[PDB]
Amino acid sequence: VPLDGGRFATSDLNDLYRRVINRNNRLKRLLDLAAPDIIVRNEKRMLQEAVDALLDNGRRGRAITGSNKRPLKSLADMIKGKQGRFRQNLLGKRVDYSGRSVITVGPYLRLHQCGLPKKMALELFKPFIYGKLELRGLATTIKAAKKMVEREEAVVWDILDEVIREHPVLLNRAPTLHRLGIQAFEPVLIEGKAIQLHPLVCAAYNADFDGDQMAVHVPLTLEAQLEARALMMSTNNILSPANGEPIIVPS
Amino acid sequence: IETPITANFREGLNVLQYFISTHGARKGLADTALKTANSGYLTRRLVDVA
Amino acid sequence: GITKASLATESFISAASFQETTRVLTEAAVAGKRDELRGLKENVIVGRLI
Amino acid sequence: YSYTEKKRIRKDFGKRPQVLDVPYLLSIQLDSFQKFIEQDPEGQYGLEAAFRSVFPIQSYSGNSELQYVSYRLGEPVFDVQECQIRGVTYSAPLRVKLRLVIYEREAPEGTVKDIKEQEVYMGEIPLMTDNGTFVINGTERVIVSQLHRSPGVFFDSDKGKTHSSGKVLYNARIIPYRGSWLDFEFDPKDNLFVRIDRRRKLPATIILRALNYTTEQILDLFFEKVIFEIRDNKLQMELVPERLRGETASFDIEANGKVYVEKGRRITARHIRQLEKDDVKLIEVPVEYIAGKVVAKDYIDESTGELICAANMELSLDLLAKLSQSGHKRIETLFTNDLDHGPYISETLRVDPTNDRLSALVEIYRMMRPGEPPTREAAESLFENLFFSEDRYDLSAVGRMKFNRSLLREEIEGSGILSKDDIIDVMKKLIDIRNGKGEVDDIDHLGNRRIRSVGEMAENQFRVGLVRVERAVKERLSLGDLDTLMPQDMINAKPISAAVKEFFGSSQLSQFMDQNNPLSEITHKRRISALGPGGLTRERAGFEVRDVHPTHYGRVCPIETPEGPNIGLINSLSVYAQTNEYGFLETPYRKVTDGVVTDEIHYLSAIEEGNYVIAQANSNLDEEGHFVEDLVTCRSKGESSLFSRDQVDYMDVSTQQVVSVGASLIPFLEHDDANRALMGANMQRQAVPTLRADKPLVGTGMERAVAVDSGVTAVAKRGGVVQYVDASRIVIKVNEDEMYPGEAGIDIYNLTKYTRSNQNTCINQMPCVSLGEPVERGDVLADGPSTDLGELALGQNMRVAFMPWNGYNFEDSILVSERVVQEDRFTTIHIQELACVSRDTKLGPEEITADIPNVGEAALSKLDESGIVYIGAEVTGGDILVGKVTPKGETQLTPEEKLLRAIFGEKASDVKDSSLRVPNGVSGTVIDVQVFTRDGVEKDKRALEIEEMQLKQAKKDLSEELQILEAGLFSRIRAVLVAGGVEAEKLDKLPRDRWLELGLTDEEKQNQLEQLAEQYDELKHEFEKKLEAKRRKITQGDDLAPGVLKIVKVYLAVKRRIQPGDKMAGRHGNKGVISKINPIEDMPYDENGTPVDIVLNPLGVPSRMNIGQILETHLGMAAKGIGDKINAMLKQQQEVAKLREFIQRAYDLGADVRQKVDLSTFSDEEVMRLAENLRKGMPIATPVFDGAKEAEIKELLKLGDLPTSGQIRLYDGRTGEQFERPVTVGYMYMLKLNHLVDDKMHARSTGSYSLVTQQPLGGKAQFGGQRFGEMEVWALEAYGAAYTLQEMLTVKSDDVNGRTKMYKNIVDGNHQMEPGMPESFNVLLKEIRSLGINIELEDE
Amino acid sequence: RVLDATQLYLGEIGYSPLLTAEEEVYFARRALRGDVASRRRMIESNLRLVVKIARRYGNRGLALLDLIEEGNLGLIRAVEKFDPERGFRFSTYATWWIRQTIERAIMNQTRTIRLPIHIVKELNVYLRTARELSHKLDHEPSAEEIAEQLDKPVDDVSRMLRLNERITSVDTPLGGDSEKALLDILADEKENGPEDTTQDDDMKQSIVKWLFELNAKQREVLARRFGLLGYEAATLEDVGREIGLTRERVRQIQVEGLRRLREILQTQGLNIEALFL
DNA sequence: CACGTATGCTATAATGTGTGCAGTCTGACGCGG
DNA sequence: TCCGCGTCAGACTCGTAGGATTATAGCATACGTGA
RNA sequence: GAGU
């Protein structure tokens, strides 16, 4: 693919495929030309070296290197290990309708609540706001709905307020060691850019506000909303699954 | 160490007591950064088998 | 042991996704193994219902 | 005291007299690079060394050769300023004189054939700034010094490698600076082996055979002799008494006529001294004792001439008989012991498959080049080219030096190539260590860890460049004609320039300078790294190296290192520490002679230090006599105990020298746990400079040193009176005594104004002098961004109360008063840089026009005719900055766009829409715009207006230079003319243009007029060529990247005020996030009515054990108490006398105050200016370990009429009732860290998606989705939440059908799940089939 | 045992005998005349020359083994076109073919995007010019400085230096941390995301719904022209194929459908609102 | 035909690689002699 | 059956910055598509 | 480099 600056960028497989094709076609040539056998042999060794490099580079001997010194990433490498397909892109994913920010105390909150920044929530619930805007007839079309939310019009905040009521959001803290590392709350919109966390669940998250950050996820489907409210809600998940003990305790 | 720290934090440590404190402290901190990975690998193996 | 027990599951998608992936897929490819997808790992990978 | 100190004196509670002042803090960087460019004549250094090393080089034919004469650095085309604005490297051209000499092949060495000498350009080398940085591509970058294993020799041993045997195997390693590694090692069977570059293992004796050592000679080298005389019939043996030690006597030991030991009897000390004193030389022995002794030399039968026994062969009764009967009656055995003198080499010769020298060279050759057929030529060549060739092997001076001292030699300096002596000596010492005499070294010892500053590394890359060019040169010299070929036609600059740019650019050690703070800069430049090339890896690093080493004392900080995976490896240098000439770390120490402590100082290296006993600095001196107490606390051999006074050899110079610069700035560090202190010194570096530079009330004293030495403050080169103050510049007129007789003697410092930092913070210099003020040399003329009157000001002190409050300070959470926000004191300035690129594309050039399809006139209002936003214009997300678009081709317009454009009429234009607009949610004021145009593209009308600005501004700048310089210069001639013919007002009447014609008598003063006349004309022409240069650079169509026609850079400024989610901290490693900004009415307030600024949670103290923060608070309050009392006396206007009395009594409070400060010397006016500054609060210094004691702080509180407890009665702002008990209240100096919530908050519903995996991108800069990782997945699995999980795998991520369908369902209210298959799995399959494994889906 | 492909090949060539002038001529006479043995002996004997030359053309594009095969192909052409009757030696002649064949192959394979020999050779003369200029101008040479020296167009020089921009690998990580590379930031531009896809669905469904509210004849003359409801996007004159069969009446009714629809967008709340879009 | 792209030919004699780095990581578990 | 060499693993999210280099002669006749 |  072409970069903006007129440059190109390509996969290592293309360099490896080029190696294999050049040596293979040269072998076709040497066979049409009836070449002496020592030369035939060297080309067959070269072909095996290039195929081996293409399938699994650093396996048989020295991996074939780029100008950077670094060995070219082969097919096997794209399945293999942490950077491979399984671990990186398939058992764990980048996810839509996800945010993160600093957390801070919300001592006024009840156990089922969390302070959710207005700007953050406006963007996370974008399609829900557009759909409600068309039902009120405030927005003629989606482009008009988009421009209304960009302008952050006064009526849009009242709609946003309408949508987030009774809608659970997931808060997550790294690292996620046990299931309580994710809990659902009912969000409370706040002006200001930090998430407000309930004190008593600080224990489950191992969250202390020395600058900790947390991640926000919106359950979209009716199924997901009910999964969040019934299974994952903080009010519903008090006891440690490890020992029969209440994990929610004043500190 | 054969010679302990006779002083306390309100009293204030001297250069040698503080230098001696350092070793233990930094061993602790280095353990946090480095060992969390062996423990986590064990979590991973366990999860995978169950 | 945990590691070998996870690799002993009939599901080769689960086995390969854990570790040792080069060896797992050669063993499965030569046996002509068919994974009927009962496990959680396997369903998460194909993006289906747990 | 100095003039700037007369304005504000810091009260010092230190008690130890300072024998050594803090050195220049940026020593390392500047000395090192100075040595790299320093052209040394003999003792090659840096470039000079690089040329002498590679050159002179000759052709492969040997007839033609290139020799080096001399080099020069051209002066830099663009200065630091222009380089920073343009985005180019600040460098000098390298011009090298080189002489092509040619030999005749007919004459022997016909050197007088062709000699062609000329000066060739090869590359520009980056220059170091005044403050130890490089400007690369317009960005300040620092190359951090490195810490690596010193070349030389090293003896090591895995303590129980095989855990089964658990036997200690000793090894040696010879580490060169350049060449192959040479390893010697033991095996379990005690056989000595040799390996080169950890290759396949070889018997150690094989290498000796390569050096031409016969078996006989090898045994003669490592073993002693045991002599056997065969006399008459009985066997006799030559004795050394102290051989038969710790042994059992196997036979009856008797000599002349006295029986000493019986069979099976232990030979102790007593028997040995008895035998020695009796003078026993020969003893009769049994014939059967020889069975098992190893013969040393060969013996042949003189009669037959055949071998009776070869060397190293175990003797028997029959061999001995045959030896006697041939006529050998003096058998030489090898004295080999199993407890002391181990027979290692003896057993290794039996393992050695090789016989002679050639057999050994072949076997070595066969190791490193296995399979390839050996030749003798090849074997000899390879072995000589390993460790015996000038070219491929060099220990360096350091290597030979460390090598010789490790082998207990006398000679320091010598050959970089290994001699036969060297190898054998190393084997010998390894064997001594196996025997039990000698010890193995350790790598963590700073005697084995060397520091490599920039200049040596630049030198190394520069050598590589020269070596690569040398290949090209030899190859072109071979095929070249001798006559036509110029020397510069063979040299290429690209390879050298490429090696050096690759160092200052690709290298791990060359990184973006950390400059969000003066302290951050100065600490970053004094950083040491064990990483990068020739170093350890984060992955490769154990725990031993990381941990604090006894040798670190006074050299490296124990308390300064990142709490990352880089925890052991990155380290700040200690305060007084310095680089040894050879590169080892050294620390100053005060020499103690006869118990009397001299003021002579000695820097001791790591190795030297171990040998003496050093007293601690805390020892009480008897006023220049000796130690008061008869026991003194000292340390030697890296361990600490009591000693007598006369035993003490040295003493610590300063209390401070154990700690680094960063840590030295923590007051009451003595009362803080090392963990918290680490975090404290690390976070102090992240303190963002506020709008108002506020001095810290509770300091240490290092503040002044850091601020001045960092270079961010303008300091006076020469003392005198200030002629002209301005916001933009400062002119000082120099005093007659310092003022040179040549020039006018007026220094002009132009101050650097609101400019961008690397962290997007704001760098501004403010003038801190008044117009017409007398100034001392080396005083602060202007303050840098985080400095107040020459002291370091990283944040702001304020009124703090430690008490819980309604959970708004729960876990470190901080409750701050709106008052602080209102006073705008924590407010910060941020400068961002946006650029707009007009490129040349396939379709055509992009235009920077204001004429853009589909733009409101509201938007076009802020753009000028050219399409560039006006200076001063406020902008917010989506507003257009620079009107730039990219050309577009043909595009199937959808039927709806056909219809829509038919309604409106406005058809699409050629260029599309790619104008640079304000990033979403960032909002600021345009403070400046820069335009780069290439050479020959038609300029914007705006670019022309900007050139008019720069030209006329340049003209004004240079005009004011020549005007102030001419006024100052004639003002001197006027004074010279008065010395001789004084006619003051009479000379000034007729014009000043007709002045230099007037002379004086033929004296030194007539020659002074001539000097001033020559320089006046010098400046006259200099002004012309300077202005021509300025005008050329302003006209200069900047050379940009290929494809790019012009680039417009907008600089936005933003004023950010503190708010919840911002990160704040003290200097004791106490972090916190602001939770709430409280109204002033609600803040806890005292009986006097004054409200607190901050309420911190006391529950963050006892666990943390950072009690520094509490002492800082108590003393801070006391300081502010004195401040409030002076403030009260100034409001009343009592008088000079009374203020003077109180202030003297205050400065001279402490039990043993070091600093005495008499106010009787201060004039009345000087007193008033001091009190004026001290009213905000009296600045106090607590040196690190030599700080203020509780008694002193309580005494200071009593002078303030504040309580001994430092706890006060506080009242709830809301209720008005008092809190139940006294609360600790005072002033803690607090910092706003770079972690602003504005930079951290991020949110996304739907956006761009990744290229192959189709899942969303990462990161807020790419508008990224949060990673829901394996650990996060498992949580949903535990919960049983199946749809939430599926959702995150499919419609949220890859499933392309699913995401759009789901979006449409969400806008239609119906939250229906419509999933499919993630696109990454489809890819997986394709990747596995590309491997040639059939993976198919069997359907239902 | 040696399993290095290189060392094994070099061993093989080592043990074939070096030729004298008269041997070369005798073999080569029969070789041109077609002697299977003769060509083989000349080739196998002169392999060592190939390796000596391929060693001088190293560290550039391909590896040593790669160079050696193309070099061999050059030596083959030399043996095919050698003139024994000319007094000139074989080694001199072969040198040309091996250097030639190696250089030409290093120009087509060295670059991921294949540059034709013409572009490459042009570029090379610009480059060697630049080297001479840099050696007297201390500072590197500008595009115009090179163009000034050749008396040639600045665009010619700049276009050629543009082609010299070398590829970056997608998989090469950024920031010393082997974490995220170009692939991990480089977004799919061709395939746009669901906000834009769903906007187009809403736009297309809006106009389809507007035809239902417009005149039946106006909706059967406007939609089928643009290809909104029809199958093929016709023009003013082409709407005569359907039922219209008119030129004036089609043009009036197309625009009459547009005028009533423009007032439908002014009233719903777009018109100049959706003008910026 | 032309514009771009390719294939071709050179005649003193030349005839066995290296080359630039790697820095040593570690505890475990199989797999040929 | 035991030494030795090989291969395989080694927490989770967040940030920052963009990217480097070399060099391939010179000229004469073909090969392919649009006009 | 930020919280573990």
Ligand SMILES: [Mg+2]
């Ligand atoms: Mg905490």
Ligand SMILES: [Mg+2]
């Ligand atoms: Mg925390």
